[PDB]
Amino acid sequence: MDVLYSLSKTLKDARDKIVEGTLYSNVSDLIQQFNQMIITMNGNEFQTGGIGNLPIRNWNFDFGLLGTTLLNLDANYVETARNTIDYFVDFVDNVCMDEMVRESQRNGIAPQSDSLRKLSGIKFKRINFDNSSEYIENWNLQNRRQRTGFTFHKPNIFPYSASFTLNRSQPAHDNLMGTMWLNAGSEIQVAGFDYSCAINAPANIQQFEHIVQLRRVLTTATITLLPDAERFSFPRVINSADGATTWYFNPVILRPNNVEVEFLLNGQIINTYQARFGTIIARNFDTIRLSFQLMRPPNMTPAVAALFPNAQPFEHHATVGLTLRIESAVCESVLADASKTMLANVTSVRQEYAIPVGPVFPPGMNWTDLITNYSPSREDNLQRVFTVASIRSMLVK
Amino acid sequence: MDVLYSLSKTLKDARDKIVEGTLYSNVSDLIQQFNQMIITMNGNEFQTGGIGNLPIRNWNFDFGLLGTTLLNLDANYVETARNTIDYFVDFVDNVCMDEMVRESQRNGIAPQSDSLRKLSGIKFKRINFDNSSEYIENWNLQNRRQRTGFTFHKPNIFPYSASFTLNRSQPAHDNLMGTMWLNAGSEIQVAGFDYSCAINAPANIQQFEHIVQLRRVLTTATITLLPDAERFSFPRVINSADGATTWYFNPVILRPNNVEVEFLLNGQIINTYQARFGTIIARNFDTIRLSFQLMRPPNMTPAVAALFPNAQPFEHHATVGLTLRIESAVCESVLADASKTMLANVTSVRQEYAIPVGPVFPPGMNWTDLITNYSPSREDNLQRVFTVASIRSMLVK
Amino acid sequence: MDVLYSLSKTLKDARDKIVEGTLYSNVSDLIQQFNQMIITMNGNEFQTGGIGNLPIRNWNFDFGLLGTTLLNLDANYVETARNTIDYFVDFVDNVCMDEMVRESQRNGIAPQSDSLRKLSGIKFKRINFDNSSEYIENWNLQNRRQRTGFTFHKPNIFPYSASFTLNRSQPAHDNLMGTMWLNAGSEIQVAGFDYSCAINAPANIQQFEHIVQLRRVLTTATITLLPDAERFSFPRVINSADGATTWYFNPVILRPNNVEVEFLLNGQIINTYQARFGTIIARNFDTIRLSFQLMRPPNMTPAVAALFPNAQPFEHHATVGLTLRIESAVCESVLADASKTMLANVTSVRQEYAIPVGPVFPPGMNWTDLITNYSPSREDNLQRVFTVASIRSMLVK
Amino acid sequence: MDVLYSLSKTLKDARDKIVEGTLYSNVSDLIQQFNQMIITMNGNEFQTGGIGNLPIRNWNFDFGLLGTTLLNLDANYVETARNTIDYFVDFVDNVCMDEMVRESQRNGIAPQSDSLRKLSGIKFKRINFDNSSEYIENWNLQNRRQRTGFTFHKPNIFPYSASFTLNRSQPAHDNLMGTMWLNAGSEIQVAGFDYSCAINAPANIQQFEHIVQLRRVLTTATITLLPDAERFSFPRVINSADGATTWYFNPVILRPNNVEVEFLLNGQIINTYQARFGTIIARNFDTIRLSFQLMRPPNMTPAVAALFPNAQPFEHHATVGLTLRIESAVCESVLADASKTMLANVTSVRQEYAIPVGPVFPPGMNWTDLITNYSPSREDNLQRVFTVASIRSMLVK
Amino acid sequence: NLNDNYGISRQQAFNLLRSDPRVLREFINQDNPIIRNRIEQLIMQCRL
């Protein structure tokens, strides 16, 4: 894999640096590296494809080195360089498109797409130029086992879950107490609803809690926490649990008092935030606990006192919301984001070449069912395909 | 690990072959091997333990080589050989006891117990003598990925499941239909029972089906299929689904008719057997679909007609049973059997040195809850600890 | 055949012994053997297959020798050696799969799968390395005829028979006397049942005898003889001989008294055991005679006296049982077991490649009909295919 | 004895390795060993037998060495090899029988069968080749006292015991309570019965304890523990302790609740398993304690309420069972098994040659009376004869 | 089951696929249990 990244990086740096008029002082080392690559390659014969609608292409390399006799590069040099680089690029692209589609439960870190098992030999190790990228660096780290890290912007770590929980139910659904939540991508929106505004509760207060248990540990997360969760703040008609009947929900939004957000780690507490809203931090956490309240306003005006009567009808249901987005983060494992196209490239390749469904990835690689069980096999395969996808994106986006 | 098995093998062969009176012609090779091992080792300082009640030990090898001029071995030679062998033997025992307790989710195949990583270094590769054992052979194969195999006599691949399924039930539990099953170790005992002997069912026939799904594929399984299941053939008092009440079960055995056993794989079918009993075969299978019937006898004598009336009381419930044992088999994945001690060695070491529960293996390594989810991480760690358990057992049984 | 086993053994020992870093002083002999094999094979063209869905393959051996110059093996040598060995392994697997399928009523010992006839030449006899395994040793011995023997754990010598026998019957089936038996694999569960409990009998005693006649003589059999047969000890609804009607069987167990087990040979008695249970031995036997009794208890409590009255209804049928399981054994001939996958390999290959039915083996090689008629031709062909199966399983498991 | 094992091993490896066509590089060492054996034997005269039907055979060794000018092997060499090896083979078989058929309370380890006392001389010590096998390895270990071990599969450590214990009895045997058990070979089946279904007991719970003691320690045992024992679960007619009268047992099986399996060691608790079924482990244990309970079902349907009344008739007796099979194990001492033939060969020799009964072994070597009182003298003699029987079986199976 | 145990020719396989009475009755006269069982089960299902 390192050799594949090296191939891609020297071909990128060749398409970039090797251009008419440029100066040999700048591309001497790259010419030495390209010639060493051509030498290491000349004599080998590769085969790529044969899964789904991927054509079975055979590659044979017999090329000529790049002279070191000039100072300024002329078009008669760049033309040969390009007619070699385009071939190398199509070869690497086909290799990556054959590696993004082969799965395995046993040794998912190990190269599939046996042309790459060949590249992983010891006669090919002469190609390595620089393993600079974040993904390839973390790959070399996981091989030479050490503390890794991937930085993420808006990481899709929550599987789509829109669901409620009624701690006080009736068949008529006229006096309810409970909480609703939508967890999607990088954001949570939670809302605790009581239809009686806590009239019959002690101290005119009702508690609400929501515990989200992440599948992977994050670090140095930057978070934006606000009140008044929007998508549970307007009228709704929601089904029952068994799906038989429906019930109305007419929210009137109040504020969380004694709001307490705890970022935990293996049950232990790490960060605690009380009465704070907006930009906050979390240095390490596998679990989030949001604990808010609904406090009946004691001093009410006519217009609002006419909404929270002392009897069951309750045509206006008191709500208390909390929105919480995870803007940036750092994770020892690999995920998806709103910034990087690796997952898109992988799923697009598979959808394009009609790859059957394997023992590891769910059908269509739906991130919901892929993150909801983040098995180590799935983690390894996902890191491998993401790395080669980054590699192929460094050549063709 | 290959050098650990090499150490154990050459030490066993030393303890065995090197005995007073023997002929140097038969131990010249083993002695050159032992001396190369001593040379490779001398200068290296190892550590062992640091988890549970494993005492922290430090090993420092500085030994002297063995003579090569003799013709017949004497006591003054075997004695030095033994004074040298006991050290390496306790060293290997402590190493295996340190390596059978450590776990990891990422790259379980990778050696833990960093002394063993050191041994996995490149200067210790000169100790390899012969990797003959089944376990270490399959280990080398999985490294050099190839078609593997472990051969098992009566393998424990089914977890303990003693449960029923009722397809026609009432609160009184006086006219029931369904199927009971005890699946444990290498045996399945299933029994379809109807209280009314198929008097109202169509054609006086009642159907029963039992689909068992294994967590790993098998091959070349020799199977023994018999009728008249035993442990579901006597009176019983069985609890309800929700544990509320209990019901009675007074069975009367009949013959299975239209019996069919299907050995499938990934939902596709491989083998089937219809009305064949005794010794059968399954060449590759991950699923077992048993299908049998209960056929009311059209002709009947007084005594049996006294048991099968046309009204609801039904004090004698007709049954149809099937026992199915897996005598031998082959599997690409490591399991437990009734022949090999590896699992016992691992669990004994952990129980003896008070190893807390890890992240991968359940508490106490209960094979039931360890084969109910045979995740690839668990498979890798289990193969690793079983291999080093075999290695240890070759010296200290 | 000896050369086939030699090929398999030296390929096994080459995949085991030849590993990077090992010492040439340990593999010099095996390297000379491998090079001699290569020399003997270079210049021959083999054909394999031609029956059922087995493909037709052509093998042409032109390889290069293995260097005798080194002192410590390196990876550039192991890699070439393994590239050479995998071809030989595929060739041997294909030869074994060609040989396990074919049959002959005339000189079944004489090879089939004409590539193996070619290997039986005198220019290939230089390949023999060692013949230590059980099956090949017994092969060479039985050819150089001597007193041989295979060791078996839980052998399958009894063909599946679940049947009864009535020495007093009526159309109503209300007062019966008889014996039931299940002879399957290694177990014999027999049960003599009398509905009157031996009241009208002389001396309040009723006898039962069960004679099993094996098709091949065994030796040094370890047997477990227990009372109270299990699968003839619960209620049953059994069909008449002629299938016209059925009858009920509600058993009540009693001890067998004056029990006797005679292990015989050519009608002569060899071993005899009286009132002994648990573990017993049989040094040689072709026939087993179990003889047991039902003795009406002279004294009886109220309950059991009201179960055994002196009138015909007899709603509780007295029984006396015996389980007998052969655990280990030794036999001059070849059978199946619960330990070895030879029969399984053979049957799996035939079922996979859809082999037409031949003159010797029964359709599908069902052990019941294969041991109910174990004629010398079937015995010879079965030994041959079991031997090549052992060979194939020493390489591919 | 070591010399006898060396003889058997080099003769086996001679019959195996010295074949037609093989290469002298593979058998040079074995031929040096064989020629040394010859040189050391020639000049000695042996006598074997004189007890029972064993003839008094006199052996004289006048043999010539095996040539060494050859490069490959010919039939004109294998022929002489065989004509020389068959004599040593029958001599070894006769010596092994002469050592199997002799006993001693004083120094049972010391060699009987005075030809073997001769072989134990200091001139015969030049024949030791490799003490590889399990039995001879443990022999030499015990001589040089160390942590030994024999690995067993389904060992016969339990003597046949079928009995009952009544903690509440009446002369009419109408309201009984107690426990029945059958302990045989490698299995235990224990069933606690109460005829009142725990109506008069406190909290509607009755206790049951079975304490098994083994006459030899075990280690690394793998065990299968299942509920609802099968041979104490159908109607039975059992006899009084005094054997005068009989009583009736019509059972109805329930589940053991608060089941507890305690594997102890000299009263010190080692392993404790609570409500675990299926496959379990025991690192070291001399005593087993199975403690279970019979809990009356408080919530009962009519069909089962009709069976457990509040008065004495009690025509359905509540039963609670446990089966416990020992699949594998490891023991410092030698026992019998379901996999190996040592006991069979010993007893077969003795029964074939009509050996009188000695002061140590019982008549016919009934394993039950042999394991009941497993004195160290019997243990030593049994180890000795098992070792020489394994030796004999390595030549003549 | 038939193709595995009673190894079957191309023509017999094609005709069994097409449900050909000729080869079906050739097997039923060859006393093939794998087919006789299926046919007896068709009887026991065509009883009523």
PDB file of N, CA and C in Angstrom, chain C residues 338-385:
ATOM      1  N   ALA C 338     -15.272 -42.312  14.296  1.00  0.00           N
ATOM      2  CA  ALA C 338     -15.726 -40.984  14.682  1.00  0.00           C
ATOM      3  C   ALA C 338     -14.557 -40.021  14.874  1.00  0.00           C
ATOM      4  N   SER C 339     -13.395 -40.332  14.288  1.00  0.00           N
ATOM      5  CA  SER C 339     -12.168 -39.564  14.476  1.00  0.00           C
ATOM      6  C   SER C 339     -11.564 -39.116  13.150  1.00  0.00           C
ATOM      7  N   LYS C 340     -11.684 -39.943  12.112  1.00  0.00           N
ATOM      8  CA  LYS C 340     -10.967 -39.765  10.856  1.00  0.00           C
ATOM      9  C   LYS C 340     -11.923 -39.330   9.753  1.00  0.00           C
ATOM     10  N   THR C 341     -11.421 -38.478   8.855  1.00  0.00           N
ATOM     11  CA  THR C 341     -12.204 -37.874   7.784  1.00  0.00           C
ATOM     12  C   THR C 341     -11.944 -38.521   6.424  1.00  0.00           C
ATOM     13  N   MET C 342     -11.508 -39.782   6.401  1.00  0.00           N
ATOM     14  CA  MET C 342     -11.178 -40.425   5.131  1.00  0.00           C
ATOM     15  C   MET C 342     -12.432 -40.715   4.314  1.00  0.00           C
ATOM     16  N   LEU C 343     -13.389 -41.431   4.915  1.00  0.00           N
ATOM     17  CA  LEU C 343     -14.680 -41.667   4.277  1.00  0.00           C
ATOM     18  C   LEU C 343     -15.348 -40.358   3.883  1.00  0.00           C
ATOM     19  N   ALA C 344     -15.262 -39.349   4.750  1.00  0.00           N
ATOM     20  CA  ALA C 344     -15.875 -38.059   4.456  1.00  0.00           C
ATOM     21  C   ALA C 344     -15.241 -37.411   3.233  1.00  0.00           C
ATOM     22  N   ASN C 345     -13.906 -37.420   3.156  1.00  0.00           N
ATOM     23  CA  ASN C 345     -13.210 -36.897   1.982  1.00  0.00           C
ATOM     24  C   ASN C 345     -13.649 -37.614   0.711  1.00  0.00           C
ATOM     25  N   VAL C 346     -13.655 -38.950   0.751  1.00  0.00           N
ATOM     26  CA  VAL C 346     -14.045 -39.754  -0.411  1.00  0.00           C
ATOM     27  C   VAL C 346     -15.455 -39.390  -0.871  1.00  0.00           C
ATOM     28  N   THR C 347     -16.417 -39.461   0.053  1.00  0.00           N
ATOM     29  CA  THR C 347     -17.809 -39.194  -0.287  1.00  0.00           C
ATOM     30  C   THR C 347     -17.997 -37.761  -0.760  1.00  0.00           C
ATOM     31  N   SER C 348     -17.296 -36.809  -0.140  1.00  0.00           N
ATOM     32  CA  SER C 348     -17.422 -35.415  -0.539  1.00  0.00           C
ATOM     33  C   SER C 348     -16.912 -35.203  -1.955  1.00  0.00           C
ATOM     34  N   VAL C 349     -15.793 -35.839  -2.303  1.00  0.00           N
ATOM     35  CA  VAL C 349     -15.260 -35.723  -3.659  1.00  0.00           C
ATOM     36  C   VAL C 349     -16.243 -36.307  -4.668  1.00  0.00           C
ATOM     37  N   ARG C 350     -16.739 -37.519  -4.394  1.00  0.00           N
ATOM     38  CA  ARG C 350     -17.665 -38.162  -5.324  1.00  0.00           C
ATOM     39  C   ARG C 350     -18.939 -37.340  -5.503  1.00  0.00           C
ATOM     40  N   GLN C 351     -19.516 -36.865  -4.397  1.00  0.00           N
ATOM     41  CA  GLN C 351     -20.713 -36.036  -4.472  1.00  0.00           C
ATOM     42  C   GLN C 351     -20.447 -34.723  -5.194  1.00  0.00           C
ATOM     43  N   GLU C 352     -19.249 -34.157  -5.033  1.00  0.00           N
ATOM     44  CA  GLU C 352     -18.953 -32.878  -5.662  1.00  0.00           C
ATOM     45  C   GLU C 352     -18.825 -33.027  -7.169  1.00  0.00           C
ATOM     46  N   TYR C 353     -18.109 -34.058  -7.627  1.00  0.00           N
ATOM     47  CA  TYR C 353     -17.844 -34.244  -9.048  1.00  0.00           C
ATOM     48  C   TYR C 353     -18.784 -35.254  -9.708  1.00  0.00           C
ATOM     49  N   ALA C 354     -19.924 -35.560  -9.071  1.00  0.00           N
ATOM     50  CA  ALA C 354     -21.059 -36.271  -9.682  1.00  0.00           C
ATOM     51  C   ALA C 354     -20.636 -37.565 -10.375  1.00  0.00           C
ATOM     52  N   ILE C 355     -19.919 -38.400  -9.635  1.00  0.00           N
ATOM     53  CA  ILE C 355     -19.347 -39.633 -10.169  1.00  0.00           C
ATOM     54  C   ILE C 355     -20.469 -40.628 -10.466  1.00  0.00           C
ATOM     55  N   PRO C 356     -20.642 -41.123 -11.734  1.00  0.00           N
ATOM     56  CA  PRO C 356     -21.574 -42.240 -11.962  1.00  0.00           C
ATOM     57  C   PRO C 356     -21.348 -43.432 -11.047  1.00  0.00           C
ATOM     58  N   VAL C 357     -22.381 -44.239 -10.859  1.00  0.00           N
ATOM     59  CA  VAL C 357     -22.302 -45.379  -9.957  1.00  0.00           C
ATOM     60  C   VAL C 357     -21.563 -46.508 -10.658  1.00  0.00           C
ATOM     61  N   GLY C 358     -20.695 -47.188  -9.909  1.00  0.00           N
ATOM     62  CA  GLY C 358     -19.813 -48.190 -10.460  1.00  0.00           C
ATOM     63  C   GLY C 358     -20.223 -49.600 -10.091  1.00  0.00           C
ATOM     64  N   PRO C 359     -19.385 -50.578 -10.450  1.00  0.00           N
ATOM     65  CA  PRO C 359     -19.724 -51.978 -10.162  1.00  0.00           C
ATOM     66  C   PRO C 359     -19.510 -52.406  -8.719  1.00  0.00           C
ATOM     67  N   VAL C 360     -18.714 -51.676  -7.935  1.00  0.00           N
ATOM     68  CA  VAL C 360     -18.216 -52.153  -6.642  1.00  0.00           C
ATOM     69  C   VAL C 360     -18.886 -51.421  -5.484  1.00  0.00           C
ATOM     70  N   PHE C 361     -18.744 -50.092  -5.429  1.00  0.00           N
ATOM     71  CA  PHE C 361     -19.278 -49.340  -4.305  1.00  0.00           C
ATOM     72  C   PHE C 361     -20.776 -49.096  -4.491  1.00  0.00           C
ATOM     73  N   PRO C 362     -21.546 -49.002  -3.408  1.00  0.00           N
ATOM     74  CA  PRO C 362     -22.971 -48.740  -3.555  1.00  0.00           C
ATOM     75  C   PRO C 362     -23.205 -47.300  -3.969  1.00  0.00           C
ATOM     76  N   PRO C 363     -24.410 -46.959  -4.431  1.00  0.00           N
ATOM     77  CA  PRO C 363     -24.660 -45.580  -4.882  1.00  0.00           C
ATOM     78  C   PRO C 363     -24.512 -44.576  -3.749  1.00  0.00           C
ATOM     79  N   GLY C 364     -23.565 -43.656  -3.915  1.00  0.00           N
ATOM     80  CA  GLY C 364     -23.300 -42.631  -2.929  1.00  0.00           C
ATOM     81  C   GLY C 364     -22.411 -43.053  -1.782  1.00  0.00           C
ATOM     82  N   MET C 365     -22.005 -44.323  -1.725  1.00  0.00           N
ATOM     83  CA  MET C 365     -21.177 -44.860  -0.645  1.00  0.00           C
ATOM     84  C   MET C 365     -21.847 -44.645   0.713  1.00  0.00           C
ATOM     85  N   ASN C 366     -23.030 -45.239   0.848  1.00  0.00           N
ATOM     86  CA  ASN C 366     -23.758 -45.231   2.110  1.00  0.00           C
ATOM     87  C   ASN C 366     -23.248 -46.379   2.971  1.00  0.00           C
ATOM     88  N   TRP C 367     -22.673 -46.029   4.127  1.00  0.00           N
ATOM     89  CA  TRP C 367     -21.955 -47.002   4.946  1.00  0.00           C
ATOM     90  C   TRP C 367     -22.837 -48.166   5.380  1.00  0.00           C
ATOM     91  N   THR C 368     -24.146 -47.941   5.517  1.00  0.00           N
ATOM     92  CA  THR C 368     -25.061 -49.022   5.867  1.00  0.00           C
ATOM     93  C   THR C 368     -25.007 -50.143   4.836  1.00  0.00           C
ATOM     94  N   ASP C 369     -25.341 -49.829   3.583  1.00  0.00           N
ATOM     95  CA  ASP C 369     -25.270 -50.818   2.513  1.00  0.00           C
ATOM     96  C   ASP C 369     -23.844 -51.180   2.116  1.00  0.00           C
ATOM     97  N   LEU C 370     -22.833 -50.439   2.583  1.00  0.00           N
ATOM     98  CA  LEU C 370     -21.443 -50.776   2.293  1.00  0.00           C
ATOM     99  C   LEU C 370     -20.848 -51.735   3.314  1.00  0.00           C
ATOM    100  N   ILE C 371     -21.399 -51.776   4.529  1.00  0.00           N
ATOM    101  CA  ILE C 371     -20.949 -52.702   5.564  1.00  0.00           C
ATOM    102  C   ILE C 371     -21.900 -53.886   5.712  1.00  0.00           C
ATOM    103  N   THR C 372     -23.145 -53.774   5.238  1.00  0.00           N
ATOM    104  CA  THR C 372     -24.007 -54.946   5.163  1.00  0.00           C
ATOM    105  C   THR C 372     -23.545 -55.940   4.100  1.00  0.00           C
ATOM    106  N   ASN C 373     -22.666 -55.522   3.185  1.00  0.00           N
ATOM    107  CA  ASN C 373     -22.071 -56.416   2.192  1.00  0.00           C
ATOM    108  C   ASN C 373     -20.657 -55.898   1.942  1.00  0.00           C
ATOM    109  N   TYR C 374     -19.687 -56.501   2.626  1.00  0.00           N
ATOM    110  CA  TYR C 374     -18.311 -56.021   2.700  1.00  0.00           C
ATOM    111  C   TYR C 374     -17.353 -56.951   1.960  1.00  0.00           C
ATOM    112  N   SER C 375     -17.799 -57.478   0.812  1.00  0.00           N
ATOM    113  CA  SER C 375     -17.081 -58.440  -0.022  1.00  0.00           C
ATOM    114  C   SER C 375     -15.638 -58.012  -0.296  1.00  0.00           C
ATOM    115  N   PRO C 376     -14.695 -58.965  -0.485  1.00  0.00           N
ATOM    116  CA  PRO C 376     -13.270 -58.600  -0.664  1.00  0.00           C
ATOM    117  C   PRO C 376     -12.976 -57.522  -1.699  1.00  0.00           C
ATOM    118  N   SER C 377     -13.728 -57.469  -2.798  1.00  0.00           N
ATOM    119  CA  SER C 377     -13.502 -56.424  -3.793  1.00  0.00           C
ATOM    120  C   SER C 377     -13.813 -55.048  -3.218  1.00  0.00           C
ATOM    121  N   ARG C 378     -14.982 -54.913  -2.582  1.00  0.00           N
ATOM    122  CA  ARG C 378     -15.320 -53.677  -1.885  1.00  0.00           C
ATOM    123  C   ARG C 378     -14.280 -53.339  -0.828  1.00  0.00           C
ATOM    124  N   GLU C 379     -13.803 -54.346  -0.092  1.00  0.00           N
ATOM    125  CA  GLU C 379     -12.794 -54.113   0.940  1.00  0.00           C
ATOM    126  C   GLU C 379     -11.514 -53.544   0.340  1.00  0.00           C
ATOM    127  N   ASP C 380     -11.040 -54.145  -0.752  1.00  0.00           N
ATOM    128  CA  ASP C 380      -9.810 -53.694  -1.393  1.00  0.00           C
ATOM    129  C   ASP C 380      -9.950 -52.272  -1.919  1.00  0.00           C
ATOM    130  N   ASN C 381     -11.013 -52.012  -2.687  1.00  0.00           N
ATOM    131  CA  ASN C 381     -11.220 -50.670  -3.226  1.00  0.00           C
ATOM    132  C   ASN C 381     -11.387 -49.639  -2.114  1.00  0.00           C
ATOM    133  N   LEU C 382     -12.057 -50.015  -1.022  1.00  0.00           N
ATOM    134  CA  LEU C 382     -12.242 -49.091   0.088  1.00  0.00           C
ATOM    135  C   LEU C 382     -10.916 -48.781   0.766  1.00  0.00           C
ATOM    136  N   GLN C 383     -10.082 -49.803   0.978  1.00  0.00           N
ATOM    137  CA  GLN C 383      -8.738 -49.577   1.498  1.00  0.00           C
ATOM    138  C   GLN C 383      -7.950 -48.632   0.601  1.00  0.00           C
ATOM    139  N   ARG C 384      -8.023 -48.840  -0.715  1.00  0.00           N
ATOM    140  CA  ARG C 384      -7.264 -48.011  -1.648  1.00  0.00           C
ATOM    141  C   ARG C 384      -7.704 -46.551  -1.582  1.00  0.00           C
ATOM    142  N   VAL C 385      -9.016 -46.309  -1.652  1.00  0.00           N
ATOM    143  CA  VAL C 385      -9.493 -44.930  -1.638  1.00  0.00           C
ATOM    144  C   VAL C 385      -9.270 -44.297  -0.268  1.00  0.00           C
TER     145      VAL C 385
END
